[PDB]
Structure formats: C-alpha cells, structure tokens
Amino acid sequence: MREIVHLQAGQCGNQIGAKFWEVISDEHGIDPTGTYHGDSDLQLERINVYYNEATGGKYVPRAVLVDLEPGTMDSVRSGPFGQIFRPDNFVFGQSGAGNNWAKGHYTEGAELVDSVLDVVRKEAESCDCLQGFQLTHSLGGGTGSGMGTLLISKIREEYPDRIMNTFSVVPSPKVSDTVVEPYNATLSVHQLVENTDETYCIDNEALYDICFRTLKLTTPTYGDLNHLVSATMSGVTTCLRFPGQLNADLRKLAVNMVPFPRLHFFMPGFAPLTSRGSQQYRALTVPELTQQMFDAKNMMAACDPRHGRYLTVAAVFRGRMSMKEVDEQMLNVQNKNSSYFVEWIPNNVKTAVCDIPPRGLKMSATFIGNSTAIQELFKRISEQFTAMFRRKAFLHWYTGEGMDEMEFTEAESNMNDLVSEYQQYQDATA
Amino acid sequence: MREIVHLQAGQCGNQIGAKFWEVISDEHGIDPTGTYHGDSDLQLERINVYYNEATGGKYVPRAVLVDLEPGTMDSVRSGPFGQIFRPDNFVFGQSGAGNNWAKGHYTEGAELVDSVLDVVRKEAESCDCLQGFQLTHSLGGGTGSGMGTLLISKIREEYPDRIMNTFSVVPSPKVSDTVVEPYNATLSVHQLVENTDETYCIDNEALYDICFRTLKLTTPTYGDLNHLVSATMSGVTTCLRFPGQLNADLRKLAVNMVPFPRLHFFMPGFAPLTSRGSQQYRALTVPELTQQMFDAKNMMAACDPRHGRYLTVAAVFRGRMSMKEVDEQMLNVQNKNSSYFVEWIPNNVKTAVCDIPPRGLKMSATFIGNSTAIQELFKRISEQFTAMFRRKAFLHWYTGEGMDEMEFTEAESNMNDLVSEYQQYQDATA
Amino acid sequence: MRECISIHIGQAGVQMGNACWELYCLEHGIQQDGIIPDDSSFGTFFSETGSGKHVPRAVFVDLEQTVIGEIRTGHYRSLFHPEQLITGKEDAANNYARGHYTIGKEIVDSVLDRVRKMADQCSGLQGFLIFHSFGGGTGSGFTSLLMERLSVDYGKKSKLEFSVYPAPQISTAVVEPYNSILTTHTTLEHSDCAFMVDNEAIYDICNRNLDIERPTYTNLNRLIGQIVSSITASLRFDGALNVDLTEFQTNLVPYPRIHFPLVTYSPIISAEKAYHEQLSVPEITNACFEYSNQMVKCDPRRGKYMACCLLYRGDVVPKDVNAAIAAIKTRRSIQFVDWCPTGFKVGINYQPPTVVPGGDLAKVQRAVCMLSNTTAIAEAWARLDHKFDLMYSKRAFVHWYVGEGMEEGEFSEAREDMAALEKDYEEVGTES
Amino acid sequence: MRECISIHIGQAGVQMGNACWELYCLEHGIQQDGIIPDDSSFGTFFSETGSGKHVPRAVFVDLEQTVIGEIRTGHYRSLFHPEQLITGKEDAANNYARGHYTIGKEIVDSVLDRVRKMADQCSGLQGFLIFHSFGGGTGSGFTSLLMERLSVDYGKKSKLEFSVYPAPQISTAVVEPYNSILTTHTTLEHSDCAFMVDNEAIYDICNRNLDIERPTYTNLNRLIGQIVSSITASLRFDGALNVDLTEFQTNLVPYPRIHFPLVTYSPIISAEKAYHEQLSVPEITNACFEYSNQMVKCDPRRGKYMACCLLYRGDVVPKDVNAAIAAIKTRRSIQFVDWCPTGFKVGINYQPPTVVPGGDLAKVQRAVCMLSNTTAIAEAWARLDHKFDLMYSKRAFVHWYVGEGMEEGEFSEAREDMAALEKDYEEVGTES
C-alpha cells in the first residue's frame, strides 16, 4: 500500500542515504541486522512502505545505491548499518566520474545505467501499489548530476504517472567544494525541470548556519548535517507510515505546493532545533514551534524568503497536537506577514498532522516552502555560468566526453526562463 | 511402473552421470553402498523408477556407463560413490576417440556398440513398463558425439515408441575446448534431429555465468556446474517418483513442448540460485521464484530468449505450493512479455507441481523453454563449419576413418534447413 | 578504491621515489622486508601475493646503473620485484637527444613491457604517477618517450606528473635551458597536469621553517613525499568528500596547455617549535597563500590564481574549512581571475600524516596541501625562454644535440611553442 | 590409462631422455634403484614385475657407445632393463647417409625386436614418443629408418616426436642444412606432429627468465622434461578435461604436412624471484603469447596461429582458464587464421609440477604448456632451405654422402620437397 522505492546516487547521496535508513530503522525499531524489536504495533502496520520482508523477520529496505566508484559504497557496506541492505542493490562501477557532468551522463553513466533499472524494476514489481520514487544526490558533483539526471530521466519514461521527489544538495552561494559547479549545476537544473515532480533544494552553507547559530555544536559537519536532512525527509513521508488526523502524501503536497509544472523547487525547514543545554529553557508548545519555521534562521536553503514572496507553503506536524492551535497559528502567520505571500493565491498554507512523533521527541514539524526568492539561486548560478562560459573556461573537458557547446546554451537559455518565470509572480493582482 | 534407464557416454557424460546419481541417492536416502536409510515412505514407493533391487536391500541403479577409454570410468569406479553401480554396466574400450566424430561413429564405436545393447536390453527387460531412455553426452567431443549418436540411433530402431530425452552439452559461442567442435557438433545435430524426441541444449559458458553472477563462488567449474545440471534433470523426472497435484511426465512435456518433430531443442533453467551469504536477504515465495526463470540471467543456454520468441514453455514446480499463485504468475508473465511469445499458439506455458521438494529446499522449479532464439546457435555453428570446410581444414582425419565429404554437405544442408524452419516462426499470424 | 601506477624516471625520480615508498610502508604498517605484520587501502599502491609479501605497483627506470643499484642493495631490496628496477648501461649525459632519440629508445620498449604487464593485472586503473626532472637527459628525454608511448597504448587515462622544474637562480647544470624547454614542448600535449617543484624554494622553506641549517636531497625528498601522500590519501583512506585522481585535472586545468599548478604544503614545523603553536584550521589554511610557503619560487601576488585544490587531512572540521576558505576569497591582496568565480576544490580524509622515524617534521594532528594554478608561473617560463635565447642565439651547445640524431629546427620549434605558451597565459590573465 | 612407449635416438635423445625419466621417478616417488618405497598412474610409462622393481617402457639407441655408457654406469644403471640400452660400435659422423643407409640398417632390426617385444606386452598402446636431433647422423638418419619401420608394422598408431630443430644463428656443426632437410623430407609422411625446440631459444629464456648466467645441456634438458611431463600428465594423473595422446594430432594438424607446433611453457621463474610474483592463471597464460617465451626462436607475431593446445596443470580454476583464453582471442596483435574460428584445446590435470632436487626452477603451484601451430615457422624452413642452397649450389659436401650409398638426386628431391612445404604454408596463411 503506497510503496516508496529509494534511490541514492553520488558520494553525497549514499552518505545521506546511509543516515536516512539509520533514522527510519530507529522509528520502526528495526535492528541493524534486519530483525524487528519495536514496541508499538503501528511500526509493523506500515513497515512495508520502506522495508520488504524475508522469512525469519529479516526486513530488507529497498534502497538502490549507485555510484561510479566503489569507494563510498564500500564504506557503507563496512558500516555498522551496512549489513541490512540487499547486496544485490549496490551498483558499483570501476571508473568514477571526475566531477564532469558529461562523463557521468554520456560516456560512463550510460554504461552503468542499464544495470540500475534491472534493480529498480525488481523493487518496483515487488510492490503492490508503488506510489513514487525517491532520489538523493548532489548537483555540483558528476555522479549525482550526470547519472542522477540520467536515471531520473529514465524512470520518468517508464513511470510517468508515479511520483518522483528529489532531495538535492545545491551549490552554496559563496563557498564551493568544486570548481565546475556552475556547469554541472546548470545542466542538472535544465534536466530536472522536465522530469522531477518536486525538488527540495538544500545547501551546506545554510545548513552549517543551523549548527552553530541555533544549535551550539561546532565539531561535526557531515555526520550531523545529514541527520538534519534525514529527519526532514522522514517527516515528509510520515503520513504514509503512521496514523494521522489529517493524513498527507507525496501527491497531496505536490498539488498544493506546485502551481505550475516548472515551479517545483522548494526549500525545507525543520523544528525544533534546540541545543541540549538550552533545551530546558524553552517551551515545546505549538505556537513557538511555528514561529521559527518562517524565519530565515531555520531555512535549509541559502535563499532568504524575505526578499521574495511565498507561493505555497506546507506544514507536516507530528505527535499529539491540538489541531486548533495547529490552525490558529497559521492564520496568525499569514496576516502578520501579508507582504510575504502572493495575493493571487487566497490560501498558501497546507497542514498535516501525524499522531506518532519522531524518535526522541513529542512534537515536530517539517516546513516545505515554494518561494520566488529561490530565483536568486538560479540567477546566481547563471551569472557564474555565463562568466566561465563567456571564455570557454572548461568546455574542452565536457566536449571531449560526447557533448556539444550548443547544449550549454540551451541549459543557459532554459535556466534564464526559469528565473524569468519566478520574477513574473512578484507583482500583485491587477 | 514407468521405468527409466540412464545412458551416459563420453568424459562429460560420465562425470555428469556421476553427480546425477549422488543427487538422486540423496533424495531417496540411499547410502553409497546401496542400503536404504531414508525417513519418508514415498522414497521407496517409486525407488524402482531408477534403482533395481537385490536381496538384503542393495539397490542397483540401472545406469549404463560407456566410454572408449578406461580413464574416466576408473575414476568413477574408484570414486566414493562408485561402489553402487553394477560392475557389469561399465562398458570400457581400450583405444579412446581423439575427438574425431568418424572414429567414435564408424571404426571404433562400431566395435563397442554391440556390447552396450547387450547391457541395455537386460536393463530393458527387467522393467515392467519401460517409459523411455535417458542420455547424457557432449556434442563437441568424439565419444559423446560419435558413439552417443550411434547408440541413440540404435535404441531408436528397437524402441521407436519409447521416449528418449537427451541432456547434451553444446559448444560455447566464443570459447572452445576443442578445435574440431563445428565438424563434430554439425554431424551430431544432423543425427539427433531424426532420432531424439527432446534435447536439452546447455553450454558451459552460460552455466559459468550463473556461478559468479547470481551465485558468488569462483573456485569450482566442473564439480558444481554438473551439480546444477544434475538438479535440473532431476526436476524433470520428479513427477515419476513422488506424488504431485498435477503430475507430469516425459511424454507430457514432449507433446506440450514439441509442436513439430524437428523443433525439439530446448534450453533449461533452474531456480532458486542464491548464494549462501545473500540467501537470508531474499523471500522464497512463488512470485519471485518465477521472475528469474524468464530472464537470460538464469538460462543454462548461451542463447538469449529476448532475440527470439518462445514457442512452448514448461514449468515443473516442487514442494508445497499454492496452485493459484503457481497459475496467476504465469498469466502475468505471458501478458507482460506478449512480444516474447508467438501468437499462433494461444497458450505457451505448461505447469506441473510435485509435493516433495529437492533435498535442502522447500521450493524449486525447473524451466524448459522452446525458443526460436536457439536458431542463433545452429546458425553460428554453420558459419564456423562452412569456414573450415570451405578449405578442407581437417577433413583428412575424418575421411581416413571411413567417411565421405558428401556426408558433411548433407550435415550442413540439413543444419541449414533447421535454421530456416526456426526462422519461419518469427512472423505473426496472417 | 582503484589502483594507480607510479613511474619513476631519472636520478631525481628514482631518488624521490624511494622517499615516497618509505612513507607508504609506514602509513599501512608494512615492514621493509615486504611482509605485513601478523587493509583494503593498500591495494591501490600494493599488489597482493600468495604469501604475506606485498609488491609495490611501481616501475623504476634509469639509464645509469649507479642510482638504482643503491636501491637494489639497500634495506628495501626485498620490497621491489627485481624486474621492476630497470637499469641501462650508460647515462644520458644531461642530453635531451640521447635520452629521447638514441639511447632512450633502446630501453623504452622494456619499460612498456613491465607497464603493460603491471597495468593489465588490475581490473581498473586510475592512471599513472610520473616523477622526473627537467634538468636531466633521462628525466627529460626518456620521459618524453614514455609520455608519448603512454598516450597511445593507454590514451584517455590519467597521467599525473611531479617534476623538478629548474630553479630561478641556483642551477646544478649548464644545459638546463635547452633540455628543460625541449621536454615542455613535447609533454604539453601528452600530460594532464604537472606538479612543479623547485629545489631553491624547498631549500628556502627548510631553512626558514623546518629550522635546520644543513639540508640534503635525502631530507627534501621526504618533504616531497608528504605532498604525494596527501594527494593520494583519498585513494586509500576513508574520509568525507574524498577526491579521486581524475578530479584534479578537471578542477585545475581550465585549458589544455595551462596545466602547471605549483605545489604548496602546510604545516612545516619542527618538533620543538610546534609545541609553541596551536595549528588551527585557518592557521594552516592561510599559511598556503603567502609567497614564503611555496615549492616553486614564484610570487603568487605577482599573478592571479585561476584554480585551487585543497586536500585537507587529519581530524578536520569541514565547517572551519568552509569558513577559512571564505575569508581568503575576500582579501584584496588575494586575487582570482575574473572568469572563475568558483575557484576552489576541497578534499578531506580521516588519516593524520605519519612521521618517518628520525624525521625532521613534527607529528601534526592536521595538515593541508594546495595545488593552486597561477598565471604568475608565466614569469618562470619567460625567464627560462630568456636563458634559452641567450645561448641558442650564438649556437653555443647545439653540436652535442645535433650529433645525437636531433634536427636543428627542433630548437626553433621548441622556443616558438613556449612563446605561444606565454601569450596563452597572458590572455587568460585578463578579462574579455 | 593406457601405455605409451618412448624411443630415444642419438646423443640428444639419450641425454634428453635421462632428464625425462628423472622427473617420472620423482612424480611417482620411484627410487632410482627401481624399487618403489614400501599407483595405477605409473603403469603407462612403467612396466610391473614380480618384485617391487618397475621397469621403464622406453628404448635407447645410439650408434656411438660413449653416450649410453654413461647411463649404463650412472646412478640409474639398475633402473633400465640391460637389453633396452642399445649401442653400436661407431658413430654416424654427423652423416645422414651413414645413419640411414649403411650403419643405421645394421642395428635397426635389433631396435625393432625390442620395440615389438615391448609393444606386444601391453594390452593397449597409445603410440610412440620419439626424441632425436635434426643435426646429427644417428638422430637424423637412424630416426628416419625407425619412422619408416614404425609406420608399417605399427601403422595407424600415434607417433609423437620432440626434435631439436636447428637454431637460427648458433650451430654446433657444419652440415646441419644437408642433414636437417633430408630427414624432414622422409619424416613428413611418417609422423603425426613434431614438437620443435631450439637450443638458442632455450638458452635465451634460461638467461632471460631463469636468471642463471652459465647454463648447460644438463640444465636445458631438465626444462625440456617439464614440457614432456605436462604433455603426458593427462595419461597418468586424474583431472577434469583430460587430454589423450591421440587428441594432439587432430587439434594441431589441419593438414598432413603442417604438423610443426612449436613448444612453449610457463612459468619459468627462479626460486628467489618467484617470491615477488603472484602467478595468477591469466599471468601464466598471457606469458605464452609473446615472442620472448618460446622454445623455438621464431616470432609468432610475424605469422599467424592456426591451432593451439593448452595443457594446464596444478590447482587450476577452469573458469579463469575460459576467461583468460577469451581475452587472448580479442587482441589485434594476436592473429589467428581466417578459416579456424575455433582455435584452442584446453586440458587440465590435478597434479602440480614437481621440482627435481637441486633444480633451478621454483615449486610452482600451477603451470601451463602450449603447443601452438603457427605459420611463422615457415620462416625457419625458408632460412634452412637458403643455407642448404648455398652449399649444394657449389656441391661442397656431397662426396661424403655419395660414398655412403646415397644417390645424388636425393639432395635435389629433398630441397624440392621442402620448396613445396613453403608454398603449402603460404597458402594456409591466406584466405580463399
């Protein structure tokens, strides 16, 4: 019933994937070996949403892990939690992508992509109602962009009707861990706009801000940022796993949060995010929880919503919560910040409540926002893309892997139109 | 009641034969000495299908082991399981065949063949209802082709009505353990098409693929490939040995799987084939079992069924299995792959269920498929045959052993017609 | 991770290579006898065997028997497969023509035979590491042969090279301008990126930072081992944001000819001196953007950066890496090119650097290496072309090369090719 | 398995044979005294007796008493039946006519008497193994007699021969062209296939691979024992896909005249050197398809393969054999003939090679031997015909042969027959 199949590509995807299943397995009380030891029956009632089953209680999570070099996956396999995945799911190559989109999309991803579909289809025909696919990758890299966009395009052809949501890392506004991020990112966006139903744009820089600003923990970067991301994506799919007063769904959010086909890039947020030492100095009531969702302090995207206007907003609360407070506060938010919401949409907030909270908490909520302020991000990428491309900065690496500079112009022209479309919805009615 | 007499010729045949009786003796709980120690009574109820009996409980398997040199048979006799065969059955020569078909068919097999029939007839008149003969050999070699085809021709003359199925190793598409495989194979096919009721074409290369691809065991080649083959052929004859809801038979499969007399070369498949370490990460339900039968990953022939179309298909399930699932999945297979089945045959799947599973399992199934994709194999052999024969590559060895080049032309012309016939059944109705 | 082959050429390559493989044995705890004490990382640089003795996946070539003979009889004699250590009969005599035309080709095929037999025994192969010197006959003439041969048989595979670029002022030979320029002409089209290093700069750092007055090549080569170890650490040890071998060329080579990223390393501090230092992430990071810490004696402030790869190592908080890198992007003195807004490439591995026994440098908990590509290096090429023009103007040494089967026009083409390289650098230094 | 007889002719055959039977005793653990220590395999090469002393099923013939006398007084004196060691009174003097017409026929009947008495005492008989040398009187003239005699009395039975084909450049005699060509004329129609070997090639391998600077025939003959042992291992020891004696001729002889498959073996590695090697199945397999590892100094790349038999030995995974062989079929440099798509014959036996005490070669867990038949061998025949034509053109040595009851026209026929052999090879090298 409403089965989801998980895809993770690239080094970032697998690591996020890896911490994505350590959280879910904790919610359902699933031992790393795959043996159930939970306490509440609701965990088993929908355990089939993510986990298959093998006699003896062994629950097999249907994730498909793909990367062009064995490096990262070998770490996951040797991880403490690597004993759970079906060995047949790991799809590993032997020549990783050197951050060039063409290699992971034309010459190297093409050779490995056919193998992955052979593993998706088995996990696709083993589900009685397959709701939609899930994908986690990075635009900047080569494998998360090249093959990720190649794979998302393929699964769109066979499963046009099914949902396909993407949690994707976006290049940071000012810092960069790769030099060719504009080329790779620009090509990736031109390829997602046509295939992906909903995308959750996130960036490390903004997510770094949460670590030291609202939390007080400087030591970790990748062991914990992924855990915030994992909690966020888990919140989105909670309604399909536990009972709720107002149950939501990947299709419900898409309809509510996607006015037009080409405007589907959101920016998530999560709460509560309190430090262990300051937690006892804070109330856990609904009102305060809702206040921090709409502040740029707790936005996992680099774009500040203040500069733009919200088009659609979705909240997915959790735990035993009073639905009156869940609704009075949203009416309060809309009126207080009337300039932050577009007039041509009378209502911009979607609510959903789940009875069971996340592990270690009694209250939580995942924010999903469609704001025109995200156009700044693409606008910025285009500024960087045009500057490098204006002199053919690195095109020789990309042309030499079965590609043409005409595609770059198409990717720049299509990107320019996405920015323009978001800009049209800044004006008010009439 | 429905007795089967086993024939094994050549080095490949005896080794396959040798591991063919180690499996059956395990199913019926027969000690290597020939003493019964089984637990279930059904083992004895049909133990007379393969094993004769001698006072004191000694069960004598009526196999006839023939080879032109004592080498291989001496190994079987000295084997741990060699104490079971009746010493009178071993028919050994003193000058083995040097892989030349003529010697094992005209000059050397002729001298030894009369001795073998003297041993078949005794095992033939000791059976109250003899169903049919069984033969295991190799086309590439000289003894498995020369004398094997000579013997199969003889037993056709005396027992035209009785069934005669052949499990035969076919030359691999690209690798070859002998230089004269086209000459030997081409002559063998021209001689089987007229005598053998059903043939199970298998090749090491495809069977190698199972070892490392679906299983994960690189060390063995011949000690285990023969065991996969032995399990396959055991599945085919299970209905004659154990009770079943829908009992099958060598004649039932022939009728279902042989539309025309000259189209009787199938390609088997077996399931489940899981590695010991990944077995616990897999369900043993009927649906998954049936999925891998129709994929070229689990086909013991080098020919991929995708390039061609199935004419007739037979499944022989085993164990306590729900016949509804056994039947719903086949309807599912036919509709999903409607392009893989010919229209002029409304139904292409034959099912048979046996209550008792194979040793060490609770579920199993042997696939038998008649596909026009097998014409590629003969087409390939003809390409190789015509190239060598175009310049008389090795004819002098074959002509000098009582043979004529006119026979080669007949073998090439008859082979060409077999390829043409399979090609006619690629078109659709009207 | 997948394997990478090391090719050591000339006296510089062989002598430098021995320093490197001392580090690898220490990182993986491999005994000098070749037998590991009584895991998956060493497979990239070491080949397994039925016994416990692993074999390095490297090849040593030198036209002079003297240099390799020291290895063949040293404490690492049992570490190398005897056929890997390839030796000629006579030296190239600091002659590009000899090592490239007459004597280089007599032994070139033998080296390929061992490269193929070693390259074929790996399911995958990232590429080749090549160590040589511009200022030698073997290290410049024989190298060009391998670069050409390795470009055909194994085209479209990475070929990274560490090279001893001629020093600005100091010089241990007289024909460096002729030899150095000639190889650059041939190696420009048959290489991915060259990690230049100057002995003058390394000597300056050693006396300036390591605080030892009397260094030697045995000491410098150990420092050069660190940059190699940090560069290849991502292929052996686990760590967040691993950087593969083929990623360097994409990030640090905007154009096919502009592939000369000078090396930098930090921290280089003596054991006693380190006790008075904190070694924070920004401290080591900011230590690589000053002209007093470079392996090539060129001033970055004279030119402009156009690509930089940072390979952090040890217990590193990437958040600090992000903050430290951001600060460097907002300093007027630090100047990147106009058309490369995205000019960094970070890399982290959870494996602190190891200290060679009796080594000079301290046991740092954390370290960083930079592979910045700067247009200030065009100054070095111009100087080298200036020295070359002074000699060939009077035709002062060509008779040695002409007599070794080398056409006269090669010098003319060599300078003209380098002349275009100067203009190519100049255009990249401006904005259209 | 059934018996096979060994016939050793000439100084080369007798000296080579002693090396072989040292290996057989070691493989089966037979004491040099002939008495086995205090099973079914040795019956093929050893005859049983009421006592524990087994007798080798071989015959030694030499027109010169000197060579065999060493055996008759050596540590193997009690191993051989005294009548097997047949000796003449005077040497053939490197004269084909003497060993074939005048003195060869004086002792030929005596050898047949022992062959018949030894051939009749076996229920079955695979064939004969014959060791001789083209460059001798006994090994070339007397051999031709036995080939003719053994063709009538025992026709239609296998006659395999290992022969010391004349080396390309080195030569231990002056009349090799005359003698070598004459026997080829007579042995072409009375043999199945000849396993040629050249001392020049074996010497080159010994210094190149075995890494011993000063070899001797006592050393080379031990290497030649390995190819014989591996070839005949299938007749003694159990193993998957055993290859019988008569199978070689069918696979490696497309046409009656083209039956000269040059021998190859692998691995030939010294004990100390082997510790630095892995010895994988592909490694040894790919070592046999290079012109640096051949027992006949001919370059396969010059010509084309047309048949190959691979006799693997030891603990071998046939899956790896299938994979390794497949790779060799898809290399442009490796070139098979157009009309033989199926050009391999595999063979495996579960018996690793044994090391002779004090031997040079190591104790390999696994080994392979190839019997490829290549048209590149036509180059050797053409060279031999060229040397023959130089001498007989001036009629420089015929007087020795004519005076020994040899007609003049025999030289004319001998060259014409070899001339047709060249054309026969040429046609097979192309496609119709």
Ligand SMILES: Nc1nc2c(ncn2[C@@H]2O[C@H](COP(=O)(O)OP(=O)(O)OP(=O)(O)O)[C@@H](O)[C@H]2O)c(=O)[nH]1
């Ligand atoms: N860093 C470092 N540089 C070295 C070392 N040995 C030699 N060099 C440099 O090599 C340069 C000259 O090239 P060489 O390597 O000496 O000559 P070659 O490559 O052996 O070629 P030949 O002249 O034929 O011997 C000198 O200017 C040195 O700076 C070393 O051990 N470490």
Ligand SMILES: Nc1nc2c(ncn2[C@@H]2O[C@H](COP(=O)(O)OP(=O)(O)OP(=O)(O)O)[C@@H](O)[C@H]2O)c(=O)[nH]1
């Ligand atoms: N491999 C090998 N070759 C040998 C050995 N002894 C002799 N030969 C070869 O034999 C060739 C000449 O033929 P011989 O065997 O010496 O002469 P022969 O067969 O005894 O005939 P006669 O001249 O009558 O003595 C030489 O060129 C050697 O290469 C040996 O012990 N091992």
Ligand SMILES: Nc1nc2c(ncn2[C@@H]2O[C@H](COP(=O)(O)OP(=O)(O)O)[C@@H](O)[C@H]2O)c(=O)[nH]1
């Ligand atoms: N959140 C998160 N992001 C990561 C992680 N590892 C890498 N990334 C991001 O992924 C990008 C690098 O992509 P990568 O996976 O290495 O490229 P590819 O695998 O070759 O396609 C960088 O911009 C990082 O910011 C991680 O563990 N967590």
Ligand SMILES: Nc1nc2c(ncn2[C@@H]2O[C@H](COP(=O)(O)OP(=O)(O)O)[C@@H](O)[C@H]2O)c(=O)[nH]1
């Ligand atoms: N499956 C299997 N095939 C074998 C075995 N031994 C030999 N073969 C095949 O049989 C062929 C050789 O035939 P062989 O029996 O030696 O020829 P013959 O006995 O002289 O007629 C080869 O192509 C092998 O692939 C075995 O143990 N198992």
Ligand SMILES: [Mg+2]
């Ligand atoms: Mg030197």
Ligand SMILES: [Mg+2]
């Ligand atoms: Mg002599």
